[PDB]
Scaffold this motif. Structure first.
Motif, mmCIF file in Angstrom:
data_model
loop_
_atom_site.group_PDB
_atom_site.id
_atom_site.type_symbol
_atom_site.label_atom_id
_atom_site.label_comp_id
_atom_site.label_asym_id
_atom_site.label_seq_id
_atom_site.Cartn_x
_atom_site.Cartn_y
_atom_site.Cartn_z
ATOM 1 N N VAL A 153 1.219 5.610 0.777
ATOM 2 C CA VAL A 153 0.766 6.868 1.356
ATOM 3 C C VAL A 153 1.518 8.007 0.673
ATOM 4 C CG1 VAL A 153 0.453 8.211 3.448
ATOM 5 C CG2 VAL A 153 0.355 5.733 3.574
ATOM 6 N N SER A 179 -8.549 -3.274 2.800
ATOM 7 C CA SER A 179 -7.297 -3.903 2.360
ATOM 8 C C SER A 179 -6.039 -3.347 3.044
ATOM 9 C CB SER A 179 -7.147 -3.841 0.834
ATOM 10 O OG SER A 179 -7.040 -2.509 0.375
ATOM 11 N N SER A 180 -6.138 -2.152 3.631
ATOM 12 C CA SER A 180 -5.081 -1.645 4.517
ATOM 13 C C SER A 180 -5.653 -0.759 5.624
ATOM 14 C CB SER A 180 -3.977 -0.909 3.745
ATOM 15 O OG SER A 180 -4.405 0.365 3.300
ATOM 16 N N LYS A 181 -4.905 -0.622 6.714
ATOM 17 C CA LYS A 181 -5.391 0.121 7.870
ATOM 18 C C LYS A 181 -4.440 1.234 8.300
ATOM 19 C CE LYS A 181 -8.325 -3.588 9.683
ATOM 20 N NZ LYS A 181 -8.974 -4.128 10.915
ATOM 21 N N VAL A 182 -5.012 2.368 8.694
ATOM 22 C CA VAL A 182 -4.247 3.441 9.315
ATOM 23 C C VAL A 182 -4.813 3.686 10.711
ATOM 24 C CG1 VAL A 182 -3.438 5.806 9.132
ATOM 25 C CG2 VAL A 182 -3.846 4.501 7.059
ATOM 26 N N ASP A 199 -8.932 1.645 5.761
ATOM 27 C CA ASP A 199 -9.739 1.787 6.969
ATOM 28 C C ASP A 199 -8.977 2.582 8.041
ATOM 29 O OD1 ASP A 199 -11.831 1.444 8.808
ATOM 30 O OD2 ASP A 199 -10.937 -0.424 9.572
ATOM 31 N N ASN A 243 -10.554 1.731 0.105
ATOM 32 C CA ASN A 243 -9.763 0.556 0.481
ATOM 33 C C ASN A 243 -8.869 0.768 1.707
ATOM 34 O OD1 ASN A 243 -8.487 2.044 -1.984
ATOM 35 N ND2 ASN A 243 -6.746 1.092 -0.955
ATOM 36 N N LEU A 271 4.375 10.259 11.025
ATOM 37 C CA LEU A 271 3.804 9.109 10.339
ATOM 38 C C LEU A 271 4.781 7.963 10.512
ATOM 39 C CD1 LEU A 271 1.788 7.689 8.324
ATOM 40 C CD2 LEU A 271 3.205 8.600 6.484
ATOM 41 N N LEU A 297 2.436 12.043 0.585
ATOM 42 C CA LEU A 297 2.489 13.275 1.359
ATOM 43 C C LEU A 297 2.327 14.451 0.418
ATOM 44 C CD1 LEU A 297 5.501 12.702 3.764
ATOM 45 C CD2 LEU A 297 3.149 11.875 3.973
ATOM 46 N N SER A 352 0.827 -1.215 0.000
ATOM 47 C CA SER A 352 0.000 0.000 0.000
ATOM 48 C C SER A 352 0.860 1.264 0.000
ATOM 49 C CB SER A 352 -1.002 0.023 1.162
ATOM 50 O OG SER A 352 -0.368 0.288 2.400
ATOM 51 N N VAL A 384 -0.537 7.151 12.494
ATOM 52 C CA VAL A 384 -0.300 8.577 12.609
ATOM 53 C C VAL A 384 -0.258 8.897 14.089
ATOM 54 C CG1 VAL A 384 -1.190 10.865 12.192
ATOM 55 C CG2 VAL A 384 -1.456 9.114 10.439
ATOM 56 N N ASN A 415 5.551 -2.795 4.711
ATOM 57 C CA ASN A 415 4.578 -2.986 3.633
ATOM 58 C C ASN A 415 3.885 -1.697 3.179
ATOM 59 O OD1 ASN A 415 3.383 -3.866 6.410
ATOM 60 N ND2 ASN A 415 1.602 -3.209 5.229
ATOM 61 N N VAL A 416 4.263 -0.562 3.761
ATOM 62 C CA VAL A 416 3.696 0.728 3.349
ATOM 63 C C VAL A 416 4.766 1.631 2.746
ATOM 64 C CG1 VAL A 416 2.519 2.842 4.098
ATOM 65 C CG2 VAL A 416 1.798 0.628 5.021
ATOM 66 N N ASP A 417 4.564 2.034 1.496
ATOM 67 C CA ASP A 417 5.508 2.914 0.815
ATOM 68 C C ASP A 417 5.049 4.378 0.906
ATOM 69 O OD1 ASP A 417 7.667 3.762 -0.765
ATOM 70 O OD2 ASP A 417 6.491 3.518 -2.616
ATOM 71 N N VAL A 418 5.938 5.261 1.366
ATOM 72 C CA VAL A 418 5.632 6.687 1.474
ATOM 73 C C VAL A 418 6.297 7.490 0.348
ATOM 74 C CG1 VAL A 418 5.718 8.744 2.943
ATOM 75 C CG2 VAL A 418 5.432 6.489 3.991
ATOM 76 N N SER A 419 5.521 8.337 -0.325
ATOM 77 C CA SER A 419 6.064 9.210 -1.366
ATOM 78 C C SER A 419 5.641 10.662 -1.133
ATOM 79 C CB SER A 419 5.637 8.739 -2.763
ATOM 80 O OG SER A 419 4.223 8.612 -2.853
ATOM 81 N N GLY A 420 6.217 11.572 -1.908
ATOM 82 C CA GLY A 420 5.964 12.989 -1.745
ATOM 83 C C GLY A 420 6.837 13.577 -0.654
ATOM 84 N N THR A 421 6.656 14.866 -0.415
ATOM 85 C CA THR A 421 7.471 15.599 0.532
ATOM 86 C C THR A 421 6.630 16.655 1.233
ATOM 87 O OG1 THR A 421 9.570 15.349 -0.702
ATOM 88 C CG2 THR A 421 9.391 17.230 0.787
#
Lengths: 82, 82
Positions: A4, B1-4, A74, A72, B67, A6, A2, B29, B72-78
């Motif tokens: 995220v 399918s994913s949780k935050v 939660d 998708n 964050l 920013l 998945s 978070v 399994n979680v990919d972070v992008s942006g700035t």
């Protein structure tokens, strides 16, 4: 498995590109610290329209920062206001 | 399918329960607005240790908000600092 994204929009049209990530099933963290207060409310109204149309959600997670999610993703837990 | 998971710790041990979510493959978070500044740095050091051990990441996304992600979680942006 998945993603995220920013986002720190400096113009309104950048906040409008956030919709694309959401349509591609990515959660987006949006920090509105660069946007004047009235325009920031407008951005939040725009994103609220966007996530609602696609079964997503939007919620404030701090001062000037919002978590926008597609259907998708939660969200659980609570962050209260100061 | 994913949780935050949203977290707003009021004591250090609550911030320590964040590790469990990360071990169960959930992004978290963390809003540290209820924690005094020196103790908040300690929490961030603790979570930094935790995510590193499991191949995760941690990053500040706003004032007093972080964050934390598992591998399994990919972070992008700035998001830049003000």
């Amino acid at each position: 498995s998945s993603k995220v994204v920013l986002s720190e929009p400096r113009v309104y049209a950048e906040a409008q590109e956030i919709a694309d990530h959401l349509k591609n099933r990515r959660a987006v963290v949006v920090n509105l610290q660069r946007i004047q207060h009235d325009q920031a409310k407008r951005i939040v109204d725009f994103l609220s329209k966007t996530v609602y149309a696609i079964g997503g959600d939007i919620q404030r997670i701090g001062s000037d920062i919002f978590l926008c999610t597609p259907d998708n993703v939660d969200v659980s837990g609570t962050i209260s206001e100061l």
